[PDB]
Amino acid sequence: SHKEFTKFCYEVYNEIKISDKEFKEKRAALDTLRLCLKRISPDAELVAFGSLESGLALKNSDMDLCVLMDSRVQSDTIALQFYEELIAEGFEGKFLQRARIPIIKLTSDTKNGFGASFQCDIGFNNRLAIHNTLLLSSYTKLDARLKPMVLLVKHWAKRKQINSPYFGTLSSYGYVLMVLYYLIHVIKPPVFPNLLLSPLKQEKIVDGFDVGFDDKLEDIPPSQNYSSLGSLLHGFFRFYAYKFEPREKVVTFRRPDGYLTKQEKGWTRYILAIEDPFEISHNVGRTVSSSGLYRIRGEFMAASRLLNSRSYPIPYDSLFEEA
Ligand SMILES: Nc1ccn([C@@H]2O[C@H](COP(=O)(O)OP(=O)(O)OP(=O)(O)O)[C@@H](O)[C@H]2O)c(=O)n1
Ligand SMILES: [Mg+2]
């Protein structure tokens, strides 16, 4: 059935999704940040990416931003100038640089009214992340079930302590890709086509990678999968609990049948292997340790068992209880 579980899923979704109120405050914050950038470099553009842009944001979301500028202009000089303007304007945070890549990490706002724990990461010419976000935004527009499904999975992973890339588990973006892989290449009939492998896809090279995909969404036929949100979630938990083979296989968006071995990739960390759809050299699961994968799989299994339980009433709330 999944009727009661679906009802429960939509109720949780409405409580965890970013409110219209917080969203418009994040937009106001972006406008302020843009004004500060204007004063420093009139040619540069400040753009948002990640879950606020794709519509996949939970409450109390962080902001992910990228400064776009002339590639002939070295990013560190403008980065520092931007950072110093932000301090003068009452933001708090850090200026840092890993290798050649400068980053600003804002952690507070003391004047502009966006909060004592206003969090905002600023990159410089991170064009790949913009493209990744365009892909996720396109899928989110293609089927209305994706948004609530992703938010629920993200909320679950947080509650189960398996959403900690610094402590041996998986990033939120990694969970999003696991969702999409399931909806494109596992479920039958598929919820989504693979937009990268479309015969209408046009090559577009950005920083050496092909970020092309079919984005003419209005011409794409609606899904022939009629499953409820509840049923989609249960199949998702089941696939990664019992069917997916993390020791051998790679989550991939580059194969018509979604089949790819770690050996073909030379990805023999590679404990969990998730090939970023555009930056194919990047394993999104590289943060996942052996013990971390054990807990991830354990939680997939526990979720599957809960939804398959014949002991009624099923305590659906325990899906989002802290492990
Ligand atoms: N390996 C990664 C991870 C991050 N990003 C980009 O950075 C964004 C933010 O990543 P993440 O922190 O994992 O998502 P959040 O929305 O910030 O997490 P949450 O919604 O749970 O708060 C992603 O959408 C993605 O575009 C990326 O390009 N490649
Ligand atoms: Mg984000």
Curated annotation (Swiss-Prot):
Residues binding UTP: S51, A129, N132, T133, K154, K158, S172, Y173, H282
Result, substituting F49D: Impairs catalytic activity
Catalytic reaction annotation: RNA(n) + UTP = RNA(n)-3'-uridine ribonucleotide + diphosphate; RNA(n) + ATP = RNA(n)-3'-adenine ribonucleotide + diphosphate
Residues that hold Mg(2+) according to the record: D62, D64
PAP-associated domain sequence ranges: 228-282
A molecular function GO annotation: UTP binding
Compartments, record wording: Cytoplasm
One Gene Ontology biological process: negative regulation of nuclear-transcribed mRNA poly(A) tail shortening
Residues engaged in binding ATP: R286
Signal peptide residue numbers: none
Phenotype upon gene inactivation: Stabilizes urg1 transcripts.
The protein's Enzyme Commission number: 2.7.7.19, 2.7.7.52
Cofactor: Mg(2+); Mn(2+)
Consequence of changing K105A: Reduces association with a 15-mer A stretch but does not affect association with a 15-mer U stretch
Impact noted for substituting D121A: Abolishes catalytic activity
Keywords annotated in UniProt: ATP-binding, Cytoplasm, Magnesium, Manganese, Metal-binding, Nucleotide-binding, Nucleotidyltransferase, Transferase
One Gene Ontology CC term in the entry: cytoplasm
Stated role: Cytoplasmic uridylyltransferase that mediates the terminal uridylation of mRNAs with short poly(A) tails such as such as act1, hcn1 and urg1 mRNAs, hence facilitating global mRNA decay. Uridylates the 3' ends of actin mRNAs upon S-phase arrest. Also has a weak poly(A) polymerase (PAP) activity. Residue His-282 is responsible for the specificity for UTP. Involved in cell cycle arrest where in association with crb2/rhp9 and chk1 it inhibits unscheduled mitosis.
Family assignment from sequence similarity: Belongs to the DNA polymerase type-B-like family.
Entry protein name: Terminal uridylyltransferase cid1
Gene that specifies this protein: cid1
Segment of the intact protein contained: 40 to 377 of 405
